[PDB]
User: Which sequence fits this backbone?
């Protein structure tokens, strides 16, 4: 029984040791900047919502990874962060550095 | 003019510094084990064929990454390697270790 609801970053890192990937993707919307979390399961399936991950865990052979290890919070600094930037050349996606990540976490809404 | 056709592993690593990801995925087919290379562009788009990457480079703002930096060879040991395994529990995808990769490269056809 995982009764404690707040995953630690160490926990959220654990699937990344078992073939999963986590990304946080940031872009400007209607009025402000927003971020969204994606997971990729070890088979390569992209998942954007927590209920998709729950279904995946039920449909797949998973040993070490459980629902307690996931977080869709774009404020949790685990995994690779990307941002959509506009210049006169067009919209570009760039991966953020570690140094850039904390300011983005503060900025998204 | 890139006249030299054989990309070095250092070259194939370069997009991975500019937000791209590369994977090699191995599974047993009709009669033997086979591997396939996927790229993810910095926007998150999954690409499985070299002409998809050429089209992407034309449709996107890319500064440092050029067609010379790509290889769809599952024998090029750059990026993350995954393999589909069968046990009585079911089919499982696992990420391979560095130590495991060379034997797989030799084994695929």
Assistant:
């Amino acid at each position: 029984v995982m009764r404690r609801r707040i995953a630690t970053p160490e926990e959220v890192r654990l699937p990344l040791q078992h073939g999963w990937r986590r990304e946080v993707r940031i872009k400007k919307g209607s009025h402000r900047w927003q971020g969204e979390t994606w997971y990729y399961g070890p088979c390569g399936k992209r998942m954007k919502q927590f209920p998709e991950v729950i279904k995946y865990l039920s449909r797949n052979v998973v040993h070490s990874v459980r629902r307690e290890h996931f977080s869709f919070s774009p404020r949790m600094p685990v995994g690779d962060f990307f941002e959509e930037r506009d210049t006169p050349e067009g919209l570009q996606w760039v991966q953020l550095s570690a140094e850039e990540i904390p300011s983005r976490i503060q900025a998204i809404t």
